[PDB]
Amino acid sequence: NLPTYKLVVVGDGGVGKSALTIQFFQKIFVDEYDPTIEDSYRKHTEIDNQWAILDVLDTAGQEEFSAMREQYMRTGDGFLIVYSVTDKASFEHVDRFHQLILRVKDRESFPMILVANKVDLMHLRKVTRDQGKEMATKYNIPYIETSAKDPPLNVDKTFHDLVRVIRQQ
Ligand X SMILES: Nc1nc2c(ncn2[C@@H]2O[C@H](COP(=O)(O)OP(=O)(O)NP(=O)(O)O)[C@@H](O)[C@H]2O)c(=O)[nH]1
* Residue 21 beta carbon to Mg ion: minimum distance, rounded to whole angstroms: 8
* Residue 109 beta carbon to Mg ion: minimum distance, rounded to whole angstroms: 27
In the complex with ligand X, the residue whose CB is nearer, 67 or 140, is: 67
Quote the strand ranges of 13-111, DSSP E.
38-47, 50-59, 78-84
Q: Closest by alpha carbon to 86, among 119, 123, 114, 125?
A: 125
Confirm or reject binding of residue 60 to ligand X (CB under 6 A): yes
Residues 6+ positions from 38 with CB-CB distance below 8 Å: 57, 58, 59, 60, 65, 68, 69, 72
Q: Of these partners, ligand X, Mg ion, none, which one is at the site of residue 102 (CB under 5 to 8 Å by kind)?
A: none
* Residue 124 beta carbon to ligand X: minimum distance, rounded to whole angstroms: 9
| Max Cα distance, the chain (Å) | 47
Q: Of these partners, ligand X, Mg ion, none, which one is at the site of residue 111 (CB under 5 to 8 Å by kind)?
A: none
* Residue 16 beta carbon to ligand X: minimum distance, rounded to whole angstroms: 3
Confirm or reject binding of residue 90 to Mg ion (CB under 5 A): no
Confirm or reject binding of residue 18 to ligand X (CB under 6 A): yes
Give the three-state DSSP class for 62: coil
Which positions from 8 through 47 interact with Mg ion, judged by CB under 5 A? 17-18, 36
Whether the CB-CB separation of 114 and 142 falls below 8 Å is answered with yes
- H helix runs in 74-168, sequence order: 88-92, 94-105, 129-138, 155-166
Q: Rounded distance, CA 20 to CA 103, Å?
A: 25
Q: Which stretch binds ligand X (CB under 6 A): 42-50, 100-108, 133-141, 145-153?
A: 145-153
Residues that bind ligand X (CB under 6 A): 11, 13-19, 30-31, 33, 35-36, 60-62, 117-118, 120-121, 147-149
Residues that bind Mg ion (CB under 5 A): 17-18, 36
